[PDB]
């Protein structure tokens with residue numbers, strides 16, 4: 001199949017995601033609606049159930065609402081069974097309509113539907129070329145009170161009907177009992193509870209194994225991707241070990257939520273996206289777009305800077321999921337605001353790098369403050385709005401113009417209010433002009449592009465007051481006036497003659513797994529794939545087309561590799577770096593070192609004999625380690641993903657800047673479990 005096919009679970013860059021709050025979309029089956037005090041059929045009470053479900057979804061798919069818009073994937077609420085208690089939060093009654101209050105990860109939320117409804121969902125979607133994504137929220141269960149076990153469901157966790165345990169009398173240590181976080185530090189927000197939600201302890205084998213198994217069921221159910229909730233609140237190493245479980249089994253595109261505020265730029269965030277095995281929701285992009293097009297708290301120069309930076313910060317920028325709003329923010333559109341702002345922001349998003357996501361109702365100009373105000377019921381299924389039509393014209397370019405799905409981004413013209421950028425991939429180009437200035441037109445002269453000589457029609461057809469473009473030789477455009485609030489898309493597509501890799505997934509896996517290589521110009525005849533210097537050809541290459549190649553990772557050593565391909569004639573492609581070859585299946589192990597005292601601005605790190613530990617390269621050591629919560633300085637700890645059942649040699653180090661101090665003595669040693677988790681405790685050797 002081609003890169004653009006509905007069956008491509010490894011790449012979403014050519015897709016347009018439609019984010020849905022199941023309850024709030026469409027109640028296709030009134031019979032599963034909760035009753036009594038947990039239900040509000042008028043949906044005036046935003047904290048109860050409104051009755052939206054899988055069937056409703058299925059209906060919208062079939063009546064053409066989503067397909068008409070050009071949407072190609074849907075991202076829905078966590079489908080697992082939630083607690084049933086209504087919770088009164090100081091007078092207010094709250095239900096688990098959101099699906100974030102899990103009780104049993106092996107069952108469905110009956111308000112959403114049955115396993116059979118889930119399966120129909122998957123089928124209908126697939127039948128209409130739409131991929132399905134689900135939220136997955138393994139950080140916790142539900143709200144609990146340790147000394148008021150009668151409160152809610154005591155954070156009870158079941159395994160397919162079987163009671164594993166509760167927050168009260170947690171002898172098994174299924175949960176954390178460290179209090180609640182103040183979000184003060186990263187370590188703080190990982191090992192303490194979020195609010196009152198019962199924090200799962202991933203270091204407990206039962207929990208570990210349980211979650212790894214639960215996800216396999218859904219994978220088996222045919223899902224196309226996973227959206228992880230609260231990734232900044234779980235152990236990084238654990239999460240990496242979970243990704244390996246997915247990837248080594250049935251890889252799917254996975255992205256997590258790591259909130260960023262305005263002007264916030266975090267290196268931890270970057271690193272996580274570059275090394276965890278998953279990508280992220282692009283808050284940096286979102287926050288910046290809002291400042292520029294919404295709140296006018298920054299200008300084009302700001303947008304441009306976010307674009308260039310992010311391209312450098314993320315190893316796989318094209319995997320970050322962009323948006324203008326979602327369930328954690330006020331709706332982009334403000335009641336009294338010019339609708340053009342929202343339209344421009346959509347157009348911008350649809351044509352920019354990454355994986356675009358659209359919060360349900362956007363196309364309807366829904367307004368609403370924070371939670372739960374941003375979670376109202378979709379007032380209508382009209383395809384007559386301008387927003388609806390914008391998406392309808394642009395979404396499809398992601399599939400037919402690879403410049404959009406995988407091309408670089410380049411500023412060609414800029415001022416405070418205007419931004420003209422070019423996307424390029426192979427012999428494909430797209431040019432976008434945006435004039436945020438709703439009152440002033442702009443004189444555009446000196447525009448130079450990569451488009452071939454000729455005239456170009458605005459892809460939006462003038463919908464947002466775009467115009468035609470005239471490119472002479474040398475790709476220089478002739479002077480033109482860009483309307484106030486003006487938005488235009490111009491483009492050029494043609495066949496790519498040389499192999500060009502546009503994407504790869506998954507990015508991390510053990511040998512033997514099949515990965516997918518997407519792009520153009522691969523030719524129709526099997527060529528060769530290189531993993532670093534190792535060549536792979538013949539049978540191991542399970543499939544080869546012009547736009548997509550499927551190949552098995554050779555059994556090479558664990559490490560990072562560059563990928564490159566050669567066509568049947570031997571012409572090579574561009575390199576695609578940062579591929580991680582796991583040393584084998586992974587387990588999550590907690591490392592603890594005692595009496596490692598440091599000086600200010602000096603931290604302990606971990607290194608060792610396997611790629612998962614950096615192979616003795618200090619520049620690749622794991623850390624810095626933690627020393628507040630679970631263990632206190634000068635005791636340091638850290639959860640790490642390691643090759644299962646392997647005998648590993650390791651050592652700790654103290655780093656400051658790039659200056660390193662090794663532990664003395666001989667390597668510590670150990671053998672990783674075959675499954676489950678473990679804890680290694682040792683003392684720092686001087």
Ligand SMILES: OC[C@H]1O[C@H](O[C@H]2[C@H](O)[C@@H](O)[C@@H](O)O[C@@H]2CO)[C@H](O)[C@@H](O)[C@@H]1O
Nearest residue numbers: 411412413414415416444445446447448
């Ligand atoms: O001519 C090539 C030139 O075009 C763009 O510069 C614009 C500039 O952004 C506008 O603010 C205004 O000054 O017109 C200039 C064109 O004369 C590119 O931004 C620039 O990098 C490029 O060299």
Ligand SMILES: OC[C@H]1O[C@H](O[C@H]2[C@H](O)[C@@H](O)[C@@H](O)O[C@@H]2CO)[C@H](O)[C@@H](O)[C@@H]1O
Nearest residue numbers: 597598599600601602603626627628633
């Ligand atoms: O909280 C982590 C913290 O640990 C390290 O600092 C030690 C410091 O070296 C000691 O002299 C002592 O005062 O306790 C500190 C930890 O509370 C790192 O130096 C520091 O950067 C890091 O954040």
Ligand SMILES: OC[C@H]1O[C@H](O[C@H]2[C@H](O)[C@@H](O)[C@@H](O)O[C@@H]2CO)[C@H](O)[C@@H](O)[C@@H]1O
Nearest residue numbers: 615616617649651662663664665666667
């Ligand atoms: O370079 C690989 C080498 O790294 C580590 O050796 C350390 C040694 O432990 C330190 O005490 C210090 O002398 O620096 C050496 C780095 O060259 C591992 O201990 C060793 O097994 C490994 O081969």
Ligand SMILES: [Ca+2]
Nearest residue numbers: 029030033051
């Ligand atoms: Ca229903």
Ligand SMILES: [Ca+2]
Nearest residue numbers: 190199233234
């Ligand atoms: Ca946690």
